[model samples]
Target chain A: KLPSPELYVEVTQFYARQMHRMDGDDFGGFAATFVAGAEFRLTVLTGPEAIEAGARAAAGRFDGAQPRHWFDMMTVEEADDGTVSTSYYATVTVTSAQGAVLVEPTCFVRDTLVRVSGVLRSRSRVIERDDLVVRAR
Target chain B: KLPSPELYVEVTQFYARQMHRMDGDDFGGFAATFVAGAEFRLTVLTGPEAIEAGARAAAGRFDGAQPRHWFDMMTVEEADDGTVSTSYYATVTVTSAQGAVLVEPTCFVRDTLVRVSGVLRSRSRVIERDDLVVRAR
Candidate 1:
């Protein structure tokens, strides 16, 4: 079934916020976006704890590197039982501290969301496909 | 509020099927995907009548042109009152029937969708276009 226009507004903002916090290096704010016990599929952990730990690890993987991300959303759906699912494509370009472009990667994503006590929260978000742009590095 | 993961699968497939039919040049199949009277932003038309007529006109613009289109989805959103919305960037390369490169263009789009009696359908889609044409390809 289809969702309301407001659903798009709130959720879109939510998606943008994740990137905003991440780019600003506000891991605390970034981690705050997940559910209490949400599953972090890419990081292989569970809950907000994983969000905290995972983001920190992400930073280390590209130390002193900054990434800018763009998401190309494809679909959003809802069910009578209050389950919302979404999928999209995204591209990220990592920049080094000296202002050099390091990598440009793209992927498809699948996300499962649910309303807990009337608040939308992510249960799981996984990348379904991934690839690198030519000479991204 | 958030929705269930299962909804994602169904909606995700809906998105994929569109691109599939388009790439295959299955206009009839593509028309079947929309609601009985949905509005198509690209064509500036509404419903099957307009959909067919409008799409046919679109074909003319690309006659003898084998255009390969790619999308970079940007955002997906849902609302409380059974509306869904989305935005994305699309890149297209048009090839002559004789297999020569022509023009390439890109754009951002905004779409509004709705649900009628438990089924999901598109309501409207508006696009913001940008072009980068190169015969070098």
Candidate 2:
């Protein structure tokens, strides 16, 4: 099933907040965007505490860079089980404290979202990096 | 004024269809996305016929490269006059028929949207190219 217009905007706005939470270095805020029992595919992180820990650990690698995440070409669909699924492309641009900019490799992201107490939140997520993609011969 | 959730999704989906029509070479369909009296800022084009002509003339430049337009960081707001305005970032990626890919420069886009007979349509648009931006001294 396809998402209605209201649900579509709700989902997109959900990610808008999600991206800003991480970019603003709001680890707890970012973790709250996901469900308490969320799991990240291809990674060992589970639950909001683990996810927040992972985000906190990754913060130092930025080295004072302000990373802005950009997402586009999102497709949203509603499953029979009432969960909403979305897939999109994500790219991050890092602006250093010195004002230099660098763009990171693109990533494909898949998310399963469910409503928790009438608000949309991510239930699980999967990220595929461009560098890890297998080339077609 | 702020747009309700319904209007938000309606505008987003409007662009989703608008982008695909242009990418698929449906010039007439693309022109129809705008109001008959729509005007593009900084350009001489006016009305749907002129818009359709503009799209047609630009078709040859692609040279068999499949150009995909990606939009992100969109902000939608409704004005007191009942018109909805949206601002966003746009980037185009051109994939050659030979499978080579080229990412174009990014752009900032602003659009004025109105509901025409229960459907969203563009009333005006302004595009700012990244290369044309002026830097602070």
Candidate 3:
């Protein structure tokens, strides 16, 4: 059975929270939330090195503050294997003492929610991330 | 009732043929073939005038030639209100007096096809078309 549209919003909310954790330099907590063997593409205006630098920069800008916000619009489609493919357009905003930045990222993600050993787990992998554009105005 | 996957392919094929007939120029087709009410942001590496100049340049390259080969890959999804959205990647090769220039254009199009008095009619618009990046590689 297909999940309701509301479920899609819930999953996207979780994704936002995960990004916040990641931006706050909680790498372990961010990694722990995802399923094992899952793959994702994180796009930024700057590459991977810049991402790390941005994290460090953000830390310096804000004192004891975790400022990250993301808004998502998504569409869910069922695949042949009974897993759902969710394509999302996410606008992420990061605010710190230095300044603020917004990025619009579009991604196609494949995911499955399963019960393993009496615990519910959500596993996901990003198949494609394209058109990562940043805007301030 | 839902159409079979094969039927979806058939509809997409027809749509592609129509688009090629209507919009394809030598360098690249119009961006309007993919999305309706599309918001376009293009940075012309050459210049704004280069667009029309490129079209004219193509005319010279293919003065007395015919298109030799064309291939398209299309994916369609049914949305609410009997709307269908399709994303397509197409490669077309034209054999001109100069030689064969292969143009590969990727587009995302949203179309609403309905049966009007037992005949299928397409109400489609192109939303986005990326500027063509040509290469001899």
> Highest DockQ: which candidate?
2
Error of 2 at B70 (Å): 1.4
Q: Give the per-residue lDDT of model 2 (tens digit) for B6-98.
A: 777677789999999998999999999889889876466888889888987877777888988888777788888778988776767779978
Per-model TM-score of chain B: 0.74, 0.92, 0.46
lDDT of 3 at B71: 26
| Candidate 3 lDDT for residue B38 | 31
Query: Which runs of model 1 end up more than 4 angstroms from their true locations?
Result: A97-99, A132-137, B1-17, B20-89, B92-137
Cα error, residue A48 of model 1, in Å, equals 0.8
> Clash number for every model?
20, 0, 5
lDDT of 3 by residue, B16-127 (tens): 3443333235233333222333322223223223443534554455344433222234456665655555555443333333323334354344445543453334444333
Per-residue lDDT of model 1, residues A12-103, tens digit only: 78788888987778887877777877777663668877787787777776677878876653567787777788876655667887797653
Tell how far residue A53 is off in model 3, in angstroms: 14
What are the runs in model 3 whose C-alpha is more than 4 Å off?
A41-71, A78-82, A102-122, A127-137, B1-137
lDDT for each residue of candidate 3 in A33-101, tens digit (9 for 90 to 100) = 555544444443223344444446645644554456432223444456645555432333445455644
TM-score of 2: 0.59
TM-score (C-alpha, index-matched) for candidate 3? 0.35
TM-score of chain A of each: 0.83, 0.92, 0.51
Ranked candidates (lDDT, high to low): 2, 1, 3
lDDT of 2: 0.79
